[PDB]
Amino acid sequence: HWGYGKHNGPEHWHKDFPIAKGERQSPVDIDTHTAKYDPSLKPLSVSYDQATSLRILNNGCAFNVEFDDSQDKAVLKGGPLDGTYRLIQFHFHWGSLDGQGSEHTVDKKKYAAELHLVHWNTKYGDFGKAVQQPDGLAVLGIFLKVGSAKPGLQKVVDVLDSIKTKGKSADFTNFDPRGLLPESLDYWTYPGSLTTPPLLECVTWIVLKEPISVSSEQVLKFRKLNFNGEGEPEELMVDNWRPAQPLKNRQIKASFK
Numbered sequence: 003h004w005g006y007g008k009h010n011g012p013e014h015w016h017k018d019f020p021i022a023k024g025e026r027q028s029p030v031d032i033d034t035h036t037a038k039y040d041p042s043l044k045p046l047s048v049s050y051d052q053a054t055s056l057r058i059l060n061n062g063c064a065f066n067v068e069f070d071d072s073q074d075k076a077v078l079k080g081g082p083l084d085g086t087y088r089l090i091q092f093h094f095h096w097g098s099l100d101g102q103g104s105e106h107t108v109d110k111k112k113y114a115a116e117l118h119l120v121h122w123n124t125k126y127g128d129f130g131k132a133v134q135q136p137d138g139l140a141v142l143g144i145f146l147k148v149g150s151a152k153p154g155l156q157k158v159v160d161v162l163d164s165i166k167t168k169g170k171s172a173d174f175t176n177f178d179p180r181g182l183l184p185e186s187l188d189y190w191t192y193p194g195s196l197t198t199p200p201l202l203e204c205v206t207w208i209v210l211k212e213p214i215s216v217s218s219e220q221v222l223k224f225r226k227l228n229f230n231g232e233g234e235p236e237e238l239m240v241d242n243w244r245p246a247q248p249l250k251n252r253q254i255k256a257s258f259k
């Protein structure tokens with residue numbers, strides 16, 4: 003029932019999901035002049051060399067690339083995190099225009115899109131249990147800007163034709179998410195939530211400072227997806243992003259000076 007339109011978008015979510023007006027909601031604006039370098043933060047470890055993707059799905063909200071998380075194949079460790087967090091999936095949020103689309107902002111700047119690499123804490127055994135824990139998830143957020151094409155994204159872009167509408171999925175094996183990372187692993191980190199209902203406050207956010215560049219043609223293909231299901235009237239999948247929420251009683255820490 004919730005969505006991203008005028009009668010059911012983010013300003014309405016609180017009626018079915020009162021936690022939307024919560025104490026640690028995401029996304030937020032990242033005030034780079036207020037975030038503090040934290041020297042306690044240990045180095046970030048992104049270990050994706052044995053990653054195993056399975057499938058890509060249009061769920062009506064975005065598209066997810068799903069991974070085999072039955073073992074420690076692609077994991078996130080270090081930084082602010084205690085323990086190992088398993089890659090379960092990734093997705094994007096993007097806009098109708100290159101001037102908007104990200105969820106997090108940097109000094110109020112909106113990027114063209116935002117990549118979320120979603121990982122869960124292995125100490126809680128599965129994702130569904132992890133989301134009911136304040137330290138259950140770790141999401142790696144990577145901003146997208148429009149410029150030169152991102153070669154590691156092209157495999158993703160090409161399959162989208164086969165998952166145009168809500169409920170469609172396709173085989174997506176042997177995709178390597180290392181091709182979606184920037185050079186630098188400099189990040190900001192804060193405690194927050196999922197950015198769609200149920201909006202659970204179970205996330206440790208890790209947002210890379212360095213955006214990746216994608217081409218105009220690549221993001222235009224994202225914009226051709228549909229929110230609707232097959233044989234329903236076309237509603238382009240665009241602007242599936244939730245805006246910045248109140249930081250309230252939280253501190254954003256930086257991994258770099």
Ligand SMILES: *SCCNC(=O)CC(c1ccccc1)c1ccccc1
Nearest residue numbers: 061062063064120133196197198200
């Ligand atoms: S079209 C709805 C899209 N959202 C889902 O993928 C739901 C999913 C979730 C959350 C809480 C419990 C079970 C499943 C999810 C949402 C955001 C990030 C990761 C997973």
Ligand SMILES: [Zn+2]
Nearest residue numbers: 093095118197
């Ligand atoms: Zn997301």
